[PDB]
């Protein structure tokens, strides 16, 4: 039992660099915050229609008003979600109140940040986006693998990030509707895409202005794909 | 470098314990002289100045009311084996109400000094102690190197200049021979193996006579008396 | 490289460590198991023990049992297959505390495996390195053999040789149909194979040597050791 | 070879695991000591070693219960370990029940103390090989090796030259059929003496030497009483 | 790692992680401790940046007990937590023997520590070479340096840190005996920084009676100060 | 564990020439209520001793598992003829047993009689435990009639009495018994016993089972007793 | 060092779950499953996995089966390492006796297939296990009578499918199990009332004649189909498998 | 065991230092500055916050000044992601203070104890050092203002006025010449924005990089925080200062 992450002798912990290297190549995750709402969603490349798409979506639902969505490994996702929930009942058994998000990121970094440090582990490869409404507002969280976390209005994750920030950067004000906080999203993914086929290779998680986190379903997508 | 503590040699050896030896000769070149009539324990000091009180410094401990002992090697890593000993050998004269033999005695400081093979510390002692009792048997003199190989001597030396004063006592030594005798044979070796001066600031007797049985060291007086002999200035 | 621990796959995915375990079991005395109309006959020809010389009579035995109903023997290192035996025990008497009944065999078999597998999976277990074989007659079913290799792989057999000459004797097995051939007179068929088909390493001197036993219908099936005045009699290998 | 051997877990591409094979060999840096059985008693004898002149002979020939002794060859302190163990195992049984511990069950006892020294790559398998010489029904001789391996034999040697000594036992057949202790002694000594290397120490009063047998508990051979086998020696 | 050994033996026998260690107390402060009838001075070394970083890291001169001196050199990383064990100790003792802890024990404490570290698994040892004064039973001052290997001795003077070698030869050959309240203080000053500027901020000093230890203030120190630099031109 | 419930009654078990003749009526009463009547009391766990039984039925059936597998594991080490358990041995191991438990307060409450032969003058090194002439003298001296109350006292007699026949049937058997009786000498002694037992205790009953413990292996039968 | 299963490559890679992956394609048994109306189907090549053993020489091939059942409904096809094969079993044999425990009814075929992937994922984030080398498929029926199938890897990957081939011909079998599914759908008959004999396993049967072109000689597969009525996982007796392997003059 | 592996995270240097530690100070020395000032009327820190893009909230949150207690603040400069699990346990330590002795922890008694668990990864356990360092800043009815300094070993320094984190050499070296031993907290803020400015070799700063907040007692330890609103009016003085 000894660390396998190691400072390198340039202060860089490489190994989180090469987590992060697995971040940034995967299919790239999406998350918007309006004045009403959060809007979270991700690119799920679409493949052989073997598989049951409506079984493997990203987009998972933490609490009555929190979701989640990642970009990486799903493996080290599932064992994060669950572990998120848990820690999110936990609070709820102590506090009746429904767990804010503010903390919960707090928890799960603290709980990503071990595995940076502990040894015999590697850190998680991944990176969250945990989206959720509050008594103090609407909220939209990231979580590097490195344990460290930012707020957002918006962000994107996955590969090709880069220019899809300076995409949103240009298409994005501080007062947007929750309807038009879609369609900068979904031509942001429509754009970043290759082979675009929007339908049913997309997912869409939302807050709507304190009602329960809902994944929009299939029927609702096409609809909202007028452009 | 790499290799862990419980790894054999292409040879059979182990390495940490043959890596040991060369600690062991380091520091002071103590004597032991084992004769019917009690043990003689005697052991050098080179004080490093004139500040160190020379009284804190000792080379000849007690394990018990029966037993010396003398050092060798990591003295720091020493006193974590005689104080150990110290431990369980007041804890046999508890269970039993009788002394410990020396036998049993070094037996049990062995089985602690190659603890470190896991059959609590991870290292093996660098130490070498020369151990002598007066339990019963008549008295002993045993001598355990790190490698826990405990075997009982007549007369045998520890210490860096071991190798030259195992040889004047391989040659003077007799099994018949009386304590005054005894203390005069240390002193010689002594005097062949160490700086200029035999004065009482210099060497350590200590002796467990078999008429007593109990330990006693050598105060100025009773050290001072035998370096008269002398038998070549 | 890639071979060092257990627990590291090699890139071609062929995880070394465990198939270096395979040359070494292939390389000690073989032991052979069968089955017959009666019952099922095991062999054990511990053929490097030739040098000692100083061995007692019948000493070395490779023939262990359990239950006194199903016959483990291995061919391997002599103390991982008697850890082995151990655990074969512990797991019978575990059942029979749990069951009043002894462990059929058929999961006996698994619960070995699965003991034999889980120290394939650690940085500091070392992986065992002998195979078992299991057996066991019924007289409401026809006995079953169950050979047992390094990580897993628990297998049901006919008959089997596993050890150093494994590979022509399984030629030479499967002339006959033994399944319809008696135990009684199987042990001869037997013996003309040890005598040529080893290493030439046993000629005319091997009743010390090859020690084995059956669970046929004179045992009422169960663990019989086979009496010496059986062995000689079936030593009429006058041959050439 | 220069990297399967650095822990105790690697196998060699041979299937051959180096660091029980690297302490399988110093029982061959031991000194000789040989086991003899009788049809009704059992003689071991082993020539201790006199690391210096002053130096008193080493310890050879150990007591385990009334009718059970040993006999190391290898790292003294791997072997001090192991009567630990075993003395600890026949005072239990000899508490734990009445009867006397079952030699062929005590062997296993200790023919696994060492495996649960080699699965683990936290430690080292012991270097010593025994000779668990003892009586309970029948004289019988065992010998269990640095990896986990036991036998019965009719006759032994350890190490320093084992090879000669091995030649004097394995022509001898009078054993089995040799009663007259005082003949078989003489057959085990001599055994001895043909490991010693001449041009060197001969055999002598420290050589350790016990028996055991039907109504004999496991005793040495006390000096007075030994020195008269040592002159019917020589011729 | 965690639980394995770490100080391992060299092929020339000494154990390399306490070798380092040494190196790593050079790299200090120096530390001076003078003994005298019943009181016993010290002085060690600062070095703060000017204007900022306030003189209250007061890194040497650690309070033990109602009467125990400590001035340690190294790390100090290593340093709180080897003290905190000592002051916790002190107690430990103090309520199990109703007594207070005489300085031979805490020395003989502090060394224990010191050397379990370098004998256990998985843990680096001490950096620090600590040096105590106190009070015996009997009330008789007596300094004790440490070392991280382990090992101790009393002093009558003793100096630790970087070049230790320097300053020690200078207290060995102009140390009296029974010296007053004042020759103490000027004898420490003169040589604790014989390796170190005459600056008065650097050093500072503390002075150890019966009771209630005292810390000598910037007056008398810069005063002596004044009188080194004409003994120096 | 706590008090019993379905408790045995008294066993008989005296040696005669042949080996041993132990004897226990099969009636195991829940209380004052004859619940079960054709319990068997006296179990086999060699082929050399049997087990006698008295006190709780609960703790004969744990006390059978514990001996009972203890005998394979012997069956599995055996070697020779002469590696087998004497009875001597699980008397004091039972011994073992009660005593340890006796430290703490569970005694298992029971009266357990082991017997059986304590020699190996008589082949039988071919143990067909699964499924399975004349009789031997036996010395009188290589019989073994254990004897462990709940308390751990225990020792060996030439005939010992258990339960309830420790007040009736050993006053008979005290100025009664003779070394070295025969077959039909010893029967009519413990039906001499039985019918005792069964007009003044209350808790037994007639249908006897008798085990013979001879030199060839142990017998069972099922006599009648005729008042 | 990219020997551990823990250490990301600098490409942000895990070499060691690409080369379970590999182990697992090494052993060369194909194990084909597809779902259809209320019925599951599954098969496996019924061979020994290519390993260090010999090869089948005078084994009794009643007794080789890549197929097993975790309870009374949910079956599975376990492919990888014999010895890993047969620990994932008990594994999962376990974590549905214990989900049955502590809940009172039976596990979905998707949660025993979500557990164990919980397990798997264990392993591969510590560094002082071995990635079990077994991927295999899981089926069952819900509490809504859908057949359900599910697919889990030596990294933690529960996609669950609805026809879905594990082994070595994945480069092929994304195709031909793609277009050969579609025809069943393509007819529009609706008069498929439980006749999952002559449309499900006749179609998994015909789809693994094209997957590996051999002639499926009956005791070299075995079927387990999970349909409602059953809801048991029964094994298809041989009877009725070479009844199938006569239907190649009407169907495929 | 997998000893080939193994990095020995908690083992000496041939020279006496340790590499992880070492190399710590690398890592806290390339991330961005904080500054500490200590005046006559409070304390004050300041940090420059990193900057990634402007879809930040940067509104009410930031990762630079934390808190502690009522009377405790301090100012992270090093590795984010594991500064966190200092601020999770000082937090406890100056809790658990409180729960026992039923008063409010002395900073002086925060800092040895929160050094101490940064320095025992550094003793034992075979695990990497605690990339962070931090200001510590608090009052006290024992000596009043008080500010702290703590290292990824644990050696921690009092101090009057610091600026760890990058370019600290010049961050000092301009607050080694203007601060005043007896100051005030209105004037105290212009000294840590001038010294914020210069370290990041800009005249005046973006307003919405630097981040500001004081402890100033008023008998309840008040320690307001700064909005970026009331920050723009520090740099009018700025400009009409310097």
């Known amino acids: 039992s000894f660390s396998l992450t190691t400072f390198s002798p340039t202060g860089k912990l490489v190994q989180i660099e090469y987590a992060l290297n697995r971040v940034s190549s995967s299919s790239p995750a999406l998350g918007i915050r309006a004045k009403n709402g959060v809007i979270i969603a991700t690119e799920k490349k679409s493949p052989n229609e073997l598989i049951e798409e409506n079984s493997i979506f990203k987009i998972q639902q933490i609490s009555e008003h929190i979701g989640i969505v990642y970009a990486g490994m799903p493996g080290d996702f599932r064992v994060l979600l669950k572990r998120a929930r848990k820690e999110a009942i936990r609070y709820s058994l102590q506090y009746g109140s429904e767990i804010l998000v503010k903390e919960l990121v707090k928890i799960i970094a603290s709980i990503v940040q071990e595995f940076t440090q502990t040894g015999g582990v590697r850190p998680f490869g991944l990176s969250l986006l945990i989206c959720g409404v509050d008594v103090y507002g609407y909220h939209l969280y990231q979580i590097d693998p490195s344990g460290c976390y930012f707020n957002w209005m918006a962000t994107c994750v996955g590969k090709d990030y880069q220019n899809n920030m300076s995409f949103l950067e240009k298409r994005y004000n501080k007062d947007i509707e929750i309807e038009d906080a879609i369609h900068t999203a979904i031509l942001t993914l429509k754009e970043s895409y290759e082979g675009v086929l929007n339908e049913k290779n997309i997912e869409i998680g939302v807050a709507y202005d304190n009602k329960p986190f809902k994944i929009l379903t299939q029927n609702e997508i096409k609809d909202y794909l007028i452009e | ?233 | ?240 | 070879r220069n990297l399967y051997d650095t822990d105790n877990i690697i196998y060699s591409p041979e299937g051959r695991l180096y660091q029980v094979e690297y302490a399988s060999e110093a029982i061959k840096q031991g000194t000789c000591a040989v086991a003899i059985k009788s049809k009704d008693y059992v003689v071991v004898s082993g020539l201790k070693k006199c690391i210096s002149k002053l130096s008193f002979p080493q310890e050879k020939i150990f007591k385990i219960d009334d009718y059970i002794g040993i006999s190391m060859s290898g790292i003294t302190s791997d072997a001090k370990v192991l009567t630990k163990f075993m003395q600890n195992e026949c005072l239990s049984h000899k508490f734990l029940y009445n009867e006397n511990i079952n030699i062929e069950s005590l062997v296993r006892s200790v023919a696994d103390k060492y495996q649960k020294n080699t699965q683990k790559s936290s430690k080292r398998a012991f270097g010593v090989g025994l000779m668990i010489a003892a009586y309970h029904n029948e004289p019988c001789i065992f010998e269990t090796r640095p990896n986990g391996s036991y036998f019965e034999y009719d006759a032994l040697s350890f190490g320093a030259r084992s090879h000669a000594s091995k030649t004097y036992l394995e022509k001898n057949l009078h054993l089995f059929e040799e009663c007259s202790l005082e003949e078989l002694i003489l057959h085990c000594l001599k055994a001895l003496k043909c490991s010693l290397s001449s041009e060197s120490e001969l055999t002598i009063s420290n050589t350790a030497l016990a028996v055991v047998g039907k109504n004999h508990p496991w005793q040495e051979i006390s000096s007075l009483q030994l020195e008269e086998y040592l002159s019917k020696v020589k011729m | ?233 | 564990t706590l008090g019993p419930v379905v408790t045995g009654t008294s066993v008989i078990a005296i040696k005669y020439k042949h080996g041993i003749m132990i004897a226990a009526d099969r009636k195991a009463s829940y209380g004052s209520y004859a619940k079960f009547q054709n319990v068997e009391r006296i179990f086999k766990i060699n082929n050399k001793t049997v087990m006698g039984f008295s006190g709780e039925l609960a703790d004969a059936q744990y006390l059978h598992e514990l001996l009972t597998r203890k005998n394979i594991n012997n069956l599995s080490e055996k070697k020779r003829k002469e590696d087998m358990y004497t009875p001597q041995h699980y008397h004091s191991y039972v011994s073992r047993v009660f005593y340890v438990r006796k430290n703490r307060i569970d005694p298992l409450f029971n009266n357990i009689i082991i017997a059986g032969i304590n020699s190996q003058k008589y082949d039988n090194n071919d143990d067909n435990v699964l499924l399975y002439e004349e009789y031997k003298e036996i010395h009188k001296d290589d019989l073994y009639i254990g004897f462990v109350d709940m308390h751990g006292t225990n020792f060996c007699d030439d005939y010992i009495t258990t339960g309830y026949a420790r007040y009736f049937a050993l006053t008979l058997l005290r100025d009664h018994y003779k070394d070295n009786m025969t077959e039909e000498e010893a029967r009519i002694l413990i039906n001499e016993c039985l019918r005792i037992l069964y007009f003044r205790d209350a808790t037994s009953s007639n249908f006897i089972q008798i085990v013979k413990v001879t030199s060839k292996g142990v017998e069972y039968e099922e006599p009648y007793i005729l008042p | 060092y990219d020997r551990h299963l823990t250490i990301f490559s600098p490409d942000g890679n895990l070499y060691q779950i690409e080369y379970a992956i590999k182990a697992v394609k090494n052993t060369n048994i194909t194990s084909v499953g597809v779902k259809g109306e209320n019925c599951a189907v599954i098969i496996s090549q019924k061979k020994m996995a290519t390993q260090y053993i010999s090869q089948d020489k005078l084994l009794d091939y009643n007794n080789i089966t890549n197929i097993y059942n975790i309870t009374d409904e949910i079956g599975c096809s376990m492919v990888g390492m014999p010895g890993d094969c047969l620990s994932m079993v008990y594994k999962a044999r376990s974590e549905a006796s214990e989900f049955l425990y502590s809940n009172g009814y039976n596990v979905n075929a998707e949660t025993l297939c979500r557990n164990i992937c919980d397990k798997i994922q264990v392993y591969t984030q510590h560094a002082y296990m071995r990635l079990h080398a077994c991927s295999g498929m899981i089926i069952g029926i819900d509490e809504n009578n859908k057949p359900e199938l599910f697919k889990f890897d030596p990294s933690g990957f529960c996609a669950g499918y609805r026809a879905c081939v594990i082994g070595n011909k994945e480069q092929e079998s994304i195709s031909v199990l793609e277009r050969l599914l579609e025809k069943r759908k393509k007819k529009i008959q609706q008069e498929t009332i439980d006749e999952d004999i002559r449309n499900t396993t006749i179609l998994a049967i015909e789809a693994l004649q094209t997957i590996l072109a051999f002639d499926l000689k009956a005791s070299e597969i075995e079927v387990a189909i999970v349909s409602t009525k059953n809801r048991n996982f029964t094994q298809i007796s041989e009877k009725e498998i070479d009844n199938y392997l006569t239907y190649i003059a009407e169907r495929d | ?242």
């Open chain 3, 1 to 240: 490289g890639y071979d060092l621990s257990v627990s590291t796959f090699s890139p071609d995915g062929r995880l070394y460590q465990v198939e270096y375990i395979y040359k070494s079991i292939n390389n000690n005395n073989t032991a052979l198991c069968l089955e017959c109309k009666d019952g099922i006959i095991c062999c054990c020809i511990n053929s490097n023990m030739d040098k000692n010389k100083m061995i007692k009579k019948n000493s070395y035995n490779r023939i262990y049992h359990v239950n006194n109903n199903i016959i483990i023997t291995y061919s391997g290192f002599d103390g991982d297959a008697r850890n082995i035996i151990d655990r074969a025990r512990s797991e019978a008497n575990t059942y029979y505390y749990n069951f009043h009944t002894n462990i059929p065999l058929h999961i006996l078999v698994n619960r070995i495996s699965l003991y034999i597998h889980a120290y394939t999976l650690y940085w500091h277990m070392r992986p065992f390195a002998a195979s078992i074989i299991i057996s066991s007659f019924n007289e409401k079913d026809k006995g079953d053999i169950y050979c047992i290799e390094p990580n897993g792989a628990c297998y049901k057999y006919s008959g089997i040789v596993i050890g150093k000459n494994k590979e022509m004797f399984k030629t030479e097995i499967e002339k006959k149909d033994y399944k319809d051939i008696n135990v009684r007179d199987a042990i001869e068929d037997i013996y003309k194979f040890i005598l040529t088909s080893d290493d030439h390493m046993n000629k005319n001197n091997l009743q010390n040597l090859v020690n084995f036993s059956w669970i046929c219908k004179e045992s009422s099936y169960e663990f019989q050791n086979i009496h010496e005045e059986i062995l000689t009699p079936a030593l009429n290998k006058a041959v050439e």
């Open chain 8, 1 to 242: 065991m997998a000893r080939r592996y193994d990095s020995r995270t908690t083992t000496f240097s041939p020279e006496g230092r340790l590499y992880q530690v070492e190399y710590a100070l690398e890592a806290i020395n390339n991330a961005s500055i904080t500054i500490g000032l200590i005046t006559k009327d409070g304390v004050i820190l300041g940090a420059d916050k990193v900057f990634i893009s402007k879809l930040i909230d940067k509104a009410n949150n930031y990762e630079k000044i934390y808190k502690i207690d009522k009377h405790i603040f301090c100012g992270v400069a090093g590795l984010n992601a594991d500064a966190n699990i200092l601020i999770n346990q000082s937090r406890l330590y100056a809790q658990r203070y409180l729960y026992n002795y039923n008063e409010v922890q002395p900073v002086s008694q925060l800092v040895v104890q929160i050094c101490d668990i940064k320095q025992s990864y550094t003793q034992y356990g075979g695990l990497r050092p605690y990339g962070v360092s931090f200001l510590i800043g608090g009052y006290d009815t024992k000596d009043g203002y008080q500010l702290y300094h703590t290292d990824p070993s644990g050696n921690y320094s009092g101090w009057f006025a610091t600026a760890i984190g990058t370019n600290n050499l010049t961050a000092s070296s301009v607050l080694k010449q203007e601060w005043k031993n007896d100051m005030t907290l209105e004037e105290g803020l212009l000294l840590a924005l001038k010294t914020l400015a210069k370290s990041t070799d800009t005249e005046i700063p973006k307003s919405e990089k630097i981040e500001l907040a004081y402890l100033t007692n008023k008998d309840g330890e008040v320690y307001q925080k700064y909005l970026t609103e009331k920050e723009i009016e520090e740099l009018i003085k700025l400009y009409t200062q310097k």
């Open chain 5, 1 to 233: 790692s965690y639980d394995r050994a770490i100080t391992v033996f060299s092929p020339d026998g000494h154990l390399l992680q306490v070798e380092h260690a040494l190196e790593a107390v050079k790299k200090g402060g120096c530390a001076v401790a003078i003994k005298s009838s019943n009181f016993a001075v010290l002085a060690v070394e600062k070095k703060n940046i000017p204007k900022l970083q306030n003189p209250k890291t007061t890194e040497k001169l650690i309070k033990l007990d109602e009467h125990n001196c400590l001035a340690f050199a190294g790390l100090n990383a290593d340093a709180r937590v080897l003290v905190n064990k000592t002051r916790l100790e002190c107690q430990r003792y103090y309520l199990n023997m109703d007594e207070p802890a005489p300085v031979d024990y805490i020395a003989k404490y502090v060394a224990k520590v010191q050397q379990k570290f370098t004998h256990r698994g998985g843990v680096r040892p001490f950096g620090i070479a600590t040096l105590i004064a106190g009070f015996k039973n009997n009330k008789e001052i007596c300094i004790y340096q440490t070392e991280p290997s382990g090992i101790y001795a009393a002093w009558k003077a003793q100096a630790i840190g970087k070049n230790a070698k320097i300053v020690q030869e200078f207290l060995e050959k102009n140390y009296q005996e029974n010296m007053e309240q004042k020759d103490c203080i000027f004898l420490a000053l003169k040589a604790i920084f014989e390796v170190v500027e005459l600056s008065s901020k650097n050093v500072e000093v503390a002075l150890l009676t019966e009771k209630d230890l005292t810390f000598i203030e910037e007056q008398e120190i810069n005063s002596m100060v004044e009188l080194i630099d004409q003994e120096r031109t």
């Open chain 2, 1 to 233: 470098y790499d290799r862990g503590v419980n790894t054999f040699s292409p040879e059979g050896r182990l390495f940490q314990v043959e890596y040991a030896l060369g600690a062991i000769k380091l520091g002071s070149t103590a004597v032991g002289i084992c004769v019917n009539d009690g043990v003689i324990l005697a052991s050098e000091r080179r004080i490093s100045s004139t500040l160190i009180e020379k009284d804190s410094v000792e080379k000849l401990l007690s394990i018990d009311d029966h037993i010396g002992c003398a050092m060798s090697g990591l003295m720091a890593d020493a006193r974590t084996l005689i104080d150990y000993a110290r431990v369980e050998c007041n804890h046999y004269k508890f269970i039993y109400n009788e002394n410990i033999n020396i036998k049993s005695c070094v037996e049990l400081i062995s089985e602690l000094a190659l603890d470190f093979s896991n059959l609590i510390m991870s290292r093996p002692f660098g130490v070498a102690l020369l151990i002598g009792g007066v339990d019963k048997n008549g008295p002993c003199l045993w001598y355990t190197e790190p490698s826990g190989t405990n075997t009982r001597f007549s007369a045998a030396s520890i210490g860096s200049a071991q190798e030259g004063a195992e040889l004047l006592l391989q040659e003077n030594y007799k099994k018949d021979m009386t304590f005054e005798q005894a203390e005069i044979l240390a002193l010689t070796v002594l005097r062949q193996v160490m700086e200029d001066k035999l004065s009482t600031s210099n060497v350590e007797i200590c002796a467990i006579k078999k008429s007593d049985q109990t330990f006693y060291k050598y105060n100025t007086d009773d050290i001072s008396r035998i370096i008269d002999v002398l038998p070549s200035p």
